[model samples]
Target: NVTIYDVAREASVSMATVSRVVNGNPNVKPSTRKKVLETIERLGYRPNAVARGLASKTTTVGVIIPSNIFYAELARGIEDIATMYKYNIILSNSDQNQDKELHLLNNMLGKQVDGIIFMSGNVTEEHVEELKKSPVPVVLAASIESTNQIPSVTIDYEQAAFDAVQSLIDSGHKNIAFVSGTLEEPINHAKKVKGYKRALTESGLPVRDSYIVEGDYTYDSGIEAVEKLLEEDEKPTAIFVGTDEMALGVIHGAQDRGLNVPNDLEIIGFDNTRLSTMVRPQLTSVVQPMYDIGAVAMRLLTKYMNKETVDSSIVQLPHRIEFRQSTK
Candidate 1:
C-alpha cells in the first residue's frame, strides 16, 4: 500500500504540496507537479479516501477494469476525463472473474458511486441482467454485450479483424493463420472469429481449423500459438494476431526459430498499443482509439450522472491499421 507521504518523499516535495495537488488546489510548482505525478505512477500511489471525499457530492465514479496493458491505457483516458469533469474514480480490478466482477459492482454502488465505467472481455446474460438493476449510469468501454442493452464505447471488433485478414489476403498470403483471444467471449467468437472466417471465405482461402489458434491474449500464448502452427504440415506464410503484445511474442518466437519476419512470415496485430512500436520489426496493428473510448465512456457516464440529454446512447470509435515494419 503506497501512501501520500511516500509519494511526497519519493518526489522530494513537502507533504503539504502533495496534499494541495491531490485536493485539486492549483498552488504547486509545475516542475514539482510533474515530478509528483510521475512518482505516483511509478510507485502506483492512489489517494482513494481523499478522492472519494472530494467527489462525494456528485462525487466518485466507479471504474472496473481487467488490469492489463490494454485496460491501463483505457483507464488513463477514463481518469483524465473524470478529472476534467471534477469527479474522482473509485477504481478496482475485476481480473475478468465473474463472481469478483459482480461483487465489485455491488460494492461500488453500495459506496454510492454516481456512475460506473465497466470493461470486460466477457459480458454475459447474467451481467446484463445485473446492470439493468443498477440505480446509477453504467457504460462499457472497449467491450460489448450481445443485447446492446448497456451504453458502450467500442470499435467494430469484427470489421477490424476482417480488415487485417483481408489485407494479408490481398498481399497474396493464401495460407494465413489467425491467432485470437479466448473464443468464449462474444468479442472473440461472435465478432473477431466471424470476421476472420468471412475474410477467408471471400478471398477463396481455406478456413482450416489448424489455421485458427486460440490464445489467452498473453505474450507467451502467442509464442506457443505460432510454435504449434509452424509444427503443422502446412505452415502459414502470414499471421494475424489479436493483440499487439501477443503479436510481439509471435514475432520473437518466429525469430527464435530462425525464421525471418516479412520475408518468411508477415504479421499484423490488433490494438496499436505502445508495445507495437517497442519491437525491432515494429508491429503493424489496428489502432483502436483506446484513450478516446475511455474518455468518451466517462463523459457519457457524466452526462447520465448530471441528467444531461445524450445524443447517442452507444458510441463506436474509429479504427485503422498502423502500417509498420512487421508487414511486407
Candidate 2:
C-alpha cells in the first residue's frame, strides 16, 4: 500500500505537509496542496478512511505526561512518530497526580482513541488497575508500572543507578551521597534507591541514612540537598544526583559555598538532558534516551492497536553514563 511517506516523498513535501493537505487543514499553499493531492492520486495513497476501516481504528492516540522539561522532550518523540504513523496525538498533562491521571485516562478512552502512551514516575496499583481496564492498548513511556502487567518502554533504572553509584565508588570516594527525587516514586524508591543501596553494600560501604537526600527533582531542591549534606558531620566528598536539573543545583550549590567541583566534591547525575551541558563544568550523567523511549512506546501501542504480533510487552532500553567535568 502507498503510505503517506510515499506521497510526501513523491510530492517533495514533508509528511506533515502531506497530512495537512490530506486533512484539508487550509494551512498549505494552494500549489503545494495541489501537488500533494496529485501525488496521492498517482501513488494511490488513501488516507485514514481506508486505513482505519481496514483495522477498525480511530487513527488517534492519547498521550499522558507530566508537566516537566524531561517529559516535554519525550513528548516531542511521541508526537513525531505519531505523525509519521498517520495518527494524531492528543496530549494531556497529569501533573503526576493520581486522580488527574485516572481522569485523563478515562477521558481519552471516552474520546475513542485507538491507543494510549502514558508517562508517570510513580505508577501505583490503582493506576495499574485502571490502565489494565483500558479498552485500548496503553503503553508506558519512560515510566514504570512495577507489576509488569502493562506494556512499557524504559531503561533499566536500577542498573543505571547502580552503575552511577559504582562509578563514584570506583573514583575512590568513601563518603558518597545520593541526591534523589521523591522516594515516594517507584522509579526512585523501588528501582533507583535499591540500586544505590546495592552498590554501597557490594563495596562494603555503610549505607548511611543521612547521605540520602530527597529532592523534588528541581534546581532549588538540589541546592537545599547539598546544603543539608554539607551540614552533616560526615560530609560527602562525592554525590550521585537523580536528575540533571538537580545536578546543576548541586553544582551551583557547591560553587556558592566556594567549593570547586571534582576537587572539593565530585557529582554524577541522571537523565542526560540538554541541561547537563548548559552548566559550567558539564554534568556527567546516566544517559536515559527519553525520546527513544517515547517513540518506541508509541510504536508499540500502534502494533497492539493494529493487532500485529508483538515479541514483548516489556521493553528495556540500554543505558550508560556520560562522564564529564562534574566527575573526576
Candidate 3:
C-alpha cells in the first residue's frame, strides 16, 4: 500500500500533482506527468477506485427482483444500460415476500446506493410509503404502484390481457378460461382479470366464475390449473394463461390428457419469453417488452439521479400479440 505522499516525495512533486496525474487531470506539463507516471510505476502505487467514488458519491444502484426466470431478461436490459452509464448494480431477490422486500430496501438505503430499481408482483401501501421516504430516487420495473407517487415503467397489463382474450373470442371460442397468477397480485386481480372479463362481456359471452383458475405462476401450477378447468362440466374451448412458463404447462397438461391443441383446445399466454418458441407447437403470446421496460426504467432512474427534468414519471410502453402455433 504505497501512499501518494511517498510517490510525491520520491518524484520531487507535490501530492496534488501526483493526484492530477493519477486522475488524468490535464493541468500538469507533459514532462512532469511523465515523471509522475514513472515514479508510480516504480513504486507500484494503486489508487482506491471505491474510495475515489466516495468523493463524488457512490456510482452503484440497487436492483430488487422477485426471482431469476421472468425477471432475468429484464435484468439484462437494466445491466446493459447501467454499464453504458458507468454505474454498477447490486441485485437481490425478495421471493415476493413483503418482509423480505422491506428488509432489502432498508439494507440498500443503508449501503448508500445512488438509486434503486424495484420489481415485485404486489406493491402495497406500506411499500409505497417506504419508497416515498427514501432519500435516493426509486423506480419500478414491470410492477405497479397504484397511487403513481413513485416513478415506474411497464406495459399496459389490462390492455394486454384484453387483447389476448379478445383474440380467443375472435377465434370462435365461446367457453374461454383464464389461468391467472394469484389474485393477491394487483396486476393479476385488478388489471388482467378486469381485461379478461371486459373482453368476454363485450363479445356477448358469459363470464363464468368457475372458468377462472388461479395459479402461483409456475409450470406445475399451470398444469394444475388446466386440470381443474378440464374437470368442469362446461369445459373451456380456449384458454388465456398469465405467463409463458405456465402456458407451457397448460399445453402439456392438455396434451397429457389426450387433447389435441388448437383442435380440442386453443391457448394464449402472456409474456412472449424465449420459452414460447421452445414448445412443440410453439406458443401464441402477448409480447410484454420485458427488456424495454427494464432499459427505460434504468434510463429514467438516471435522469432522476442526475437531477434532470422528466416529462412523465409513469411510463407505459407498447405491447402486441405474437401469433404462433398454440392458437388457431
Each candidate's number of clashing pairs is 2, 0, 0
RMSD of each: 9.6, 8.5, 8.1
Instruction: Give candidate 1 misplaced runs (Cα > 4 Å).
Output: 1-56, 67-70, 96-103, 110-113, 306-314
Task: Name the Cα RMSD for model 1.
Answer: 9.6
Cα lDDT tens digits for candidate 3, 66-182: 755558888999999988887888887776566555655665554544788888777778788778877888898889967687888999989899999999999899999999998
lDDT of 2 by residue, 1-328 (tens): 4678878889998999999998898868999999999998887778866673475444788887775666877888898898778788788777647655665566655444467888776777777777877788888888886768788899999999999999999989899999999988888888889989999999999899999999998999999999999999979999999999899999999999988998999999998888999988899999888888888888888888888886645698988889999998
Per-residue lDDT of 321 in model 2:
89
The number of residue pairs in model 2 that clash at the backbone is: 0
- Candidate 3: lDDT of 307? 88
Off by over 4 Å in 2: 1-58, 67-73, 96-99, 102-113, 307-313
**True-structure lDDT of candidate 1:** 0.83
**Candidate order by TM-score, highest to lowest?**
3, 2, 1
The lDDT per prediction is: 0.83, 0.85, 0.86
Worst 10 residues of 2 by lDDT: 104-113
TM-score of each: 0.74, 0.75, 0.76
Q: Is candidate 1 or candidate 2 better by lDDT?
A: 2
C-alpha displacement of 75 in model 3, angstroms? 2.5
